[PDB]
Amino acid sequence: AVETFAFQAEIAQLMSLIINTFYSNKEIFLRELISNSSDALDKIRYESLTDPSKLDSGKELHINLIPNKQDRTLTIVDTGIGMTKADLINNLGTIAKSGTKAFMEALQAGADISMIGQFGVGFYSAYLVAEKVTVITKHNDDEQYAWESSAGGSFTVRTDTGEPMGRGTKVILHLKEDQTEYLEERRIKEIVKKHSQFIGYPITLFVEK
Ligand SMILES: O=c1[nH]nc(-c2cc(Br)c(O)cc2O)n1-c1ccccc1F
């Protein structure tokens, strides 16, 4: 069973702004997704400090970057706290209506799209480079769910029958045809070194055969 939801009008407007605005500095999407993974890893670590059983679903706290040139996908995997179905539906765990309002006021006053993370809606920067995004997630308190959207005002949620993850989130970016530089090892290494140098978890860039 696949459930289709409409985005809140303000989030659909955020997504169209990201897709339509001429903005060359698209590489910041990766910093934003790694930042969200770091935050999710911090959340499960914090819960584990008082309840070690929180890590029964996996003790390793890490981030993997998996490019696949055949599928034209870049996957960002983390073993953080994950998201429940309600978190996915509620804008992937954000207060995105108020974040979008603040971001749009900042843009009108001179900010630029790279500042999106300061408004707590950095996930949507994925649409600078992806035509479709799939988010697979597993939280200790819920089942494994797949969220997906190609923008256009809607998203889907379903229970995922695919490869079980113990706990965490996988963001699969189905890249736009002209954004394949983000599958190149040297380009990803450059972006991680430039923008993600103070992330306190191992970031492993996988290589391809
Ligand atoms: O909580 C939680 N869990 N999980 C999650 C996620 C998401 C996303 Br979109 C991404 O990319 C990743 C991840 O990991 N989370 C969150 C949300 C928001 C913000 C922050 C944070 F951490």
Numbering used by the authors: 16 to 224
What does the primary publication say about this deposited structure?
HSP90 is one of the most abundant proteins in the cytoplasm of eukaryotic cells, comprising 2–5% of cytosolic protein under non-stressed conditions. It is a ubiquitous molecular chaperone intimately involved in a variety of pathways, including cell signaling, proliferation and survival, and protein folding. The N-terminal domain of HSP90 (N-HSP90) contains the nucleotide-binding site, which has been the target site for drugs interfering with ATP binding and ATPase activity. The unbound N-HSP90 has a highly flexible lid segment comprising residues 107–14137.
The main difference between the structures is the conformation of residues 104–111, which can adopt either helical or loop-in conformations. All ligands occupy the ADP-binding site and form typical interactions, which include hydrogen bonds of the 2-hydroxyl group of the resorcinol ring with the side chain of D93 and with a water molecule that generally mediates interactions with G97. Similarly, compounds 2–5 were assigned as loop-in binders based on the similarity in size of their R1 substituent to compounds 1 and 6, for which crystal structures were determined. Interestingly, there is a strong difference in the binding thermodynamics of loop-in and helix-binding compounds. The majority of the helix-binders (7–20) have lower association and dissociation rate constants for binding to WT N-HSP90 than the loop-binders (1–6), suggesting different binding mechanisms.
